[PDB]
Amino acid sequence: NDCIFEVKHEGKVTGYACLVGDKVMKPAHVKGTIDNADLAKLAFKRSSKYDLECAQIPVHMKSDASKFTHEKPEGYYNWHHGAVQYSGGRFTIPTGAGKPGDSGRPIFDNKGRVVAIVLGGANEGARTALSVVTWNKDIVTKITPEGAEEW
Amino acid sequence: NDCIFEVKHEGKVTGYACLVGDKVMKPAHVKGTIDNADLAKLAFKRSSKYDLECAQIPVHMKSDASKFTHEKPEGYYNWHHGAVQYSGGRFTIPTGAGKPGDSGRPIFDNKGRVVAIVLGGANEGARTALSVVTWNKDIVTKITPEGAEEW
Amino acid sequence: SVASFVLLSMVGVAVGMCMCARRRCITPYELTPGATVPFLLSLICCIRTAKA
Amino acid sequence: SVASFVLLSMVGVAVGMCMCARRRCITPYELTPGATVPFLLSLICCIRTAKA
Amino acid sequence: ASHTTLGVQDISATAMSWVQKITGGVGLVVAVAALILIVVLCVSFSRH
Numbered sequence: 459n460d461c462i463f464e465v466k467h468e469g470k471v472t473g474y475a476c477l478v479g480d481k482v483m484k485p486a487h488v489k490g491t492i493d494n495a496d497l498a499k500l501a502f503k504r505s506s507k508y509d510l511e512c513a514q515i516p517v518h519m520k521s522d523a524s525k526f527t528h529e530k531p532e533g534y535y536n537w538h539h540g541a542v543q544y545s546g547g548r549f550t551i552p553t554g555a556g557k558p559g560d561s562g563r564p565i566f567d568n569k570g571r572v573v574a575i576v577l578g579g580a581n582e583g584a585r586t587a588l589s590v591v592t593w594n595k596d597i598v599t600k601i602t603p604e605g606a607e608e609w
Numbered sequence: 610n611d612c613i614f615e616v617k618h619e620g621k622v623t624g625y626a627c628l629v630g631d632k633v634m635k636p637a638h639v640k641g642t643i644d645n646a647d648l649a650k651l652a653f654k655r656s657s658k659y660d661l662e663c664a665q666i667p668v669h670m671k672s673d674a675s676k677f678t679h680e681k682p683e684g685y686y687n688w689h690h691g692a693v694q695y696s697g698g699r700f701t702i703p704t705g706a707g708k709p710g711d712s713g714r715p716i717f718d719n720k721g722r723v724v725a726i727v728l729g730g731a732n733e734g735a736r737t738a739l740s741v742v743t744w745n746k747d748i749v750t751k752i753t754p755e756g757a758e759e760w
Numbered sequence: 761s762v763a764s765f766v767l768l769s770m771v772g773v774a775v776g777m778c779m780c781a782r783r784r785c786i787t788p789y790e791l792t793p794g795a796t797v798p799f800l801l802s803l804i805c806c807i808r809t810a811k812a
Numbered sequence: 813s814v815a816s817f818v819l820l821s822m823v824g825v826a827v828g829m830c831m832c833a834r835r836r837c838i839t840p841y842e843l844t845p846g847a848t849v850p851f852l853l854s855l856i857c858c859i860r861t862a863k864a
Numbered sequence: 865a866s867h868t869t870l871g872v873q874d875i876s877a878t879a880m881s882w883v884q885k886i887t888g889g890v891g892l893v894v895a896v897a898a899l900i901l902i903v904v905l906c907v908s909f910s911r912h
Contacts, residue, residue, distance in 0.1 A: 479845035480863065505839050512843050514863065526845055545676070546794075582672035597840035597847060602811060605668040630793030631810075656787050658908070663791045677793045749791040750912060767890045774890075774897035781897075781904040788911070 459570075461524045462563065463497060465490040474562030477515055477523035478572050483591070484511045485561045485577055487608045496520070508591060508600050509577055509608075524564065526572040528595050535573060536566045542588060548603060549574065549588035556586050561609045565590065580606040610687045610717060614675050618643040624712035624760065629723045630677040633664040634742075636713050636728050638759050659751050660728050660759075661742050675715060678722040679744045686724065687717045693739070699752060700725060700739040704732055707739075712760035716741065731757040782806075834858070 465473045465488050473488030475497065482497060486509045492498040496519065502511040515523050534541040535549070542565060543550045549565065556579045564572040574590035580603040581587075587603030615625035619641025626635040626643045633648055637660045643649050651664035666674055686693040691706045693716050700716060707730060715723040725741040731754040738754035782805050789797045795810035802809055838857045841849045848862050 481845045483845065503839070503842060505843050507836075507839065508843060510843055512845075550672075580668060582668060583670050585672040587671075593844050593847075596844075598844035604671075604811070631795070632791070632793055654787055654790050656791060659788075659791060661791055744792055747789075747792060747794075747796045748911075749788050767886065770890045770894050774894045777894075777897040777901040781901040784901075784908050785904045 461522055464493040465562065466493060471559060473559060476562060476564045476572070476575060477520060478526050478564065478575075479523060480515055480517065481512050482515050482523075483562075483575060485509055485575070485591075485608075486511050487577065488561055508598055510591060510598070524566075524572050525570065526593075527567060527569070528593050529567075530573060530592065533568075536568075537576065537588075538563050547601065549590055549601070550582075550585045551579065551588050553581060553584070553586045556588070556609060558609045574601070576609070578606050578608040580604060610689065610721070612675065612721070614673070615689070615714060616644050616648060617641075623710050624714075626713060627715050627723075627726065628666055628670075628674040629715060629726070630674060631666055631671065633666050634713075634726060635662050636660055636726075636759075637662045638728070639712065659742060659749055661726075661749070661751075675717075676720070676722040677744075678718065678720075678724060679746055680718070681724050681743070682718075684719075687719075688714055688727070690714070699754065700741055702730070702737050702739060704735050704737045707737065707760065709758075709760045725752075727760065729757050729760040731755060 461477045463475045463477075464471055465475055465484060467490040472490040473485055475482055475484040475492050482500070484492070484502065486504055486506060496516060497513075500513045500516070502513040504511045517523065530544065532545055534543055536542075537551070539555050539560070540552065561577050563576050565574045565576065567573050574592040576588060576590055577600075578589040579586045580589070582603075587606060589603050589606040589608075590601050592599055592601055614627040614629075616627070618624075618626055618635065618639070623641070624636050624639040626633060626648060628634075633643070633651060633653075635643065635653075637655050637657065643651070647667050647670055648664075651667075653662040653664045655662045681695065681698075683695055686695055686700065690711060691702065694701045707727065712727050712729060714727050716725040716727065718724055725739075725743040727739055727741055728751075729740040731738045731740070733756075738757065740751075740753045740757040740759075742749065742751055744750065786797070786801075786805055786807055789795055797807060797809055801807075834857050838849070838853070838859060841847050841853070849857075849859070851861070854861050
């Protein structure tokens with residue numbers, strides 16, 4: 459908890475950055491500067507493939523980075539605005555729960571570990587599919603629901 | 610059981626279309642155009658060896674799709690006309706439990722997940738063997754009891 | 761004129777056979793929920809993945 | 813003068829392709845939290861070991 | 865003419881390997897396409 463930093467544009471908040479493990483992860487589709495000057499001055503490696511900008515955390519002065527796991531069992535996860543249901547290869551939330559500007563928020567398991575980071579979602583009718591960044595034991599991968607839009 | 614996915618495709622109904630996973634499914638042996646418009650306009654791929662036609666479920670109605678699994682433990686399964694006994698890898702019902710025109714109906718496990726779709730069956734005394742579409746890991750297969758008739 | 765016709769006809773048949781094979785070995789993947797087509801097959805049959 | 817230009821240009825392109833390949837190959841490891849670059853890969857990519 | 869007629873085509877000029885190369889190239893494409901279909905049919909046949 460409280461590992462979330464704001465990413466701001468000149469006239470608005472555009473998204474969030476999260477400290478996960480040894481690296482700070484920010485959605486590549488979000489334009490703005492991190493509120494914390496310590497992270498704002500940090501160089502990031504941009505990858506359009508996974509919609510990510512990542513950089514190493516100054517862990518010598520940033521020891522509050524969250525724990526994370528590659529495991530993705532079926533069940534419910536905590537994504538700040540409520541619970542998110544995970545089944546098969548997709549995360550699903552209530553239709554009125556999602557919104558623009560919320561990208562960058564992590565999804566936590568029942569152990570408080572980060573599982574995935576929200577980029578956006580798709581309106582499937584009664585429910586909204588959640589577009590997230592996830593990882594396996596070796597490398598980062600991305601989940602993209604059909605018709606998903608960046609938030 | 611407690612959910613209806615069975616969309617009629619004709620004024621004179623001969624079986625039903627249903628939503629399983631991410632695909633729209635109906636028996637290939639039943640004629641008519643699926644109702645509710647959104648499904649009516651879908652193109653379907655036909656396989657004469659499976660007696661099955663499938664099309665992609667539109668995103669906006671994807672949330673109404675039935676849950677799906679390939680797992681089939683021995684035991685009893687649910688459907689709208691009663692219970693189904695699964696024994697020896699085959700689905701069986703009481704004679705008279707199903708009739709012609711009742712095809713296209715999914716068979717559900719105890720978690721509400723679809724394991725098979727009814728095409729027809731063979732009437733052998735007090736019990737009827739079902740001809741069904743079922744799935745194994747990453748493959749579609751069909752079971753056709755001897756003497757089975759199309760429904 | 762005849763030789764050209766026959767050679768073109770043979771090619772058209774070869775293409776038709778390839779297209780038949782393309783449908784027959786792929787349709788079962790489309791019928792199966794999740795459309796879990798393996799990477800190598802997608803390159804061979806010139807087809808798109810489940811999330812395309 | 814032209815032959816020298818073309819040969820030098822070809823080398824510059826070959827190097828650019830190698831750098832592009834290196835970035836694409838290693839990104840998934842440097843982009844991922846908790847990930848460690850395989851020993852052989854770090855030698856191939858001509859990069860520093862792991863995270864230090 | 866002191867010689868006989870050319871007759872029915874079969875006795876045409878050498879350096880006609882162009883005919884064999886084109887015929888072979890097309891025949892090969894058919895043979896390969898046929899093999900691909902046969903393999904798929906064999907797999908499809910075994911699967912039920």
